[PDB]
Amino acid sequence: LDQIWDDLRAGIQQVYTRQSMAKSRYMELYTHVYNYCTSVGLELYKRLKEFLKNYLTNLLKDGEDLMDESVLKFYTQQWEDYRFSSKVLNGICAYLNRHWVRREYEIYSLALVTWRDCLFRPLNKQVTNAVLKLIEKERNGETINTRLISGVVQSYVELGLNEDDAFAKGPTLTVYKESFESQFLADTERFYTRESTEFLQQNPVTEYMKKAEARLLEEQRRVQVYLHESTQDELARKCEQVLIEKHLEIFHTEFQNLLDADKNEDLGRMYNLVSRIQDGLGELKKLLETHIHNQGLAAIEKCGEAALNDPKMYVQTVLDVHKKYNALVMSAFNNDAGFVAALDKACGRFINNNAVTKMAQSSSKSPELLARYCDSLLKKSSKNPEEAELEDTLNQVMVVFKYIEDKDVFQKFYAKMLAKRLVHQNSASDDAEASMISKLKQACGFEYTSKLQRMFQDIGVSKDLNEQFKKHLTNSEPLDLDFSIQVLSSGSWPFQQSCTFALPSELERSYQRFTAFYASRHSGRKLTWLYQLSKGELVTNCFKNRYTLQASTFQMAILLQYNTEDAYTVQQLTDSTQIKMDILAQVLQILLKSKLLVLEDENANVDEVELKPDTLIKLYLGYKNKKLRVNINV
């Protein structure tokens, strides 16, 4: 009414320019507002709106056109006081919000709208411009009094108009987005575009890299003390577009020049920076692949001619290159799938075709060299290998194996060498052999390693059966010699039929007894004895100093042919032993090279002169060797 309006105006003027009044004042004001609304307060609504507009105009009468560092100290303080006072006023006239705005504008929203109109006056551009000028101390200077910026930002966010838009929902940040975020984002883009190039024009790019990482960290930090939370992602995207994503050319050039050096600490930095953006790793993977390929190829180029006859050096060089670059990939580039794939492709390329394969005029020289390395590593040498070291080295051979592609040539070579190594009783560790076969099978399937498994179990079964022969021999008077035999399969071992031998009479008893024994335990089986690889012992109870010889069966036949006389020729020996011509020539040459057999001549070069069928061979009765148990073999 009228008798109430003057006192209520006095009270409202009291609540603004706050003086911390007591409960009696606010209670009597509320009583007035309740008294009017009972007797439907549209005219009171009009009076309140007009009073608010007039007070805002009075306030704007001062503080306008200051333009710097003071419109902030003005605006934030005015805003805090006005917001608090308006909240209290919404407290006082709270009967309007309950029974006249339910049949239509709540007083707090009206005060916000009027202050919004106080934003749509020259205050809007001056305040935002001063805030941006304050943040433009990004360079240095802790002059950003964060309470002079958070207040403005909170004012903008709160001023998102809601006058019956739909209803009070939550953070309505339309005004923030359309009046402050856009200018801030544009100015950030401009500032970074200028300073990034200004720095990049004077210094090596490593320092720029450090600075860019620091700036990204800083701008992530800033949104946690000044601005609103829903700007982190967008500001991050803008900074990622300006600092990086617009210098990929210089990044690629520096990446190559870094790889040519050995700096493994800032390569991680470049991986981080480039991976922050979408698909920027495209050129990095290809460039790394090319570099590691060329490194490995030119690395084994250094060995040159010496590698082609030494498996150790070749496999060692390949393993060294692979080890270094795998170590780099697993620390800097974080085991990224693409970089691991690049390493794998380059390793395949430079293992398969390189200087050694080119010099050997084929690409099946690397699997042969690997197989020969594994051979030389599993033979029984002077040193007695330690199990852990041997197992580790086999593990490394498996890597270099998994990088080759014609894994059949390797199988042929390994089968041949394992055959020799098993037949001649000359192997380091059955455990090592079994483990190697097992991991070949695990890495290439069951069909790959069937022949090797059979070749192994066959020597096992032969060792078994020889003991049973010994047991059965206790009832049949073993004539004069130790008989140890190794019965192999026929489809597995890479051995030919035979070499047309005639058995001497000194062995026929054991031969027939064992063949009859074998025929007993099995249904139908044909032992095709092969004498081209079988050794034994001779005692020579004919000479002066009781020597002992250790040679193949061919030497046994030829020597025992002299039990009658000592005047046989090439033809005379041929008749009684039925051996092939060139094989007999080779064996007689080996015998004459040894001091056992001499020709008619006393000091001839028998080692080189060819022998003719009508040439007598004389048993040298004066044979003598310094040591005992002479080993005559090649």
Binding site: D344, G445, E447
Partner: protein, 216 residues
């Protein structure tokens, strides 16, 4: 040892490619496979694609009516069904290559390495080659009067057919995920067996040709 030469514009021939412009010259014709270096190969004598076990004349007589009272129709239906099945599968091998490759990237991105998709590629190649041989071995089998040496052949190629079906079944579904150490072993053990079997079939056919063992 078959010396042939490829050049541009009874011992020269034109290339059946849709638009290749080359000439193939050879020393002496034996219905052997020649490659035009334009991406296509064909046997020099007749003019269709390379057919290893079956002779050219029977291929002609089969392709004339490529598509007789009651049982001949059943035999023809069975054989042409198998032949067209293999041809329809082979014509879509581009889709098979793309499918296995996209599988390679999909399976590699889910925390798995490169060598695995490598053996997958090898298996696919062997599968396609085996199908291409079964194609013409059926043609050879059709024009054949039943005797002792025909039952054996018809019994071996059925097993090879089954193995191929097994291989192709493995790929699609059982390359699913995170079971490499067994699925790989099964695939390898299967495609080595398939390759060995197809080599056996081709050897049997050619030995039969040499020994005059078949009857038509």
């Amino acid at each position: 040892d078959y010396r042939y030469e490829v050049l541009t514009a009874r011992l020269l021939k034109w290339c059946p490619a849709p638009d290749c412009h080359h000439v193939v010259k050879v020393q002496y014709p034996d219905a052997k496979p020649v490659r035009c270096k334009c991406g296509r190969q064909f046997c020099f004598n007749c003019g269709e694609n390379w057919h290893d076990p079956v002779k050219c004349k029977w291929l002609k007589k089969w392709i004339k009516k490529c598509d007789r009272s009651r049982a001949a129709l059943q035999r023809y239906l069975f054989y042409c069904n198998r032949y067209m099945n293999h041809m329809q599968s082979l014509r879509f091998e581009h889709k098979l290559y793309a499918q296995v490759k996209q599988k390679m990237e999909e399976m590699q991105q889910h925390n798995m390495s490169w060598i695995e998709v490598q053996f997958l590629k090898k298996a696919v190649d062997v599968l396609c080659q085996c199908r291409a041989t079964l194609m013409y071995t059926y043609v050879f089998a059709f024009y054949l009067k039943k005797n002792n040496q025909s039952i054996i052949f018809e019994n071996n190629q059925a097993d090879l057919e089954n193995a191929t079906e097994v291989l192709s079944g493995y790929l699609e579904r059982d390359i699913s995920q995170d079971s490499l150490q067994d699925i790989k072993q099964k695939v390898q053990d299967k495609y080595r067996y398939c390759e060995s079997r197809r080599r056996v079939l081709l050897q049997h056919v050619h030995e039969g040709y040499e020994k005059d063992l078949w009857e038509y």
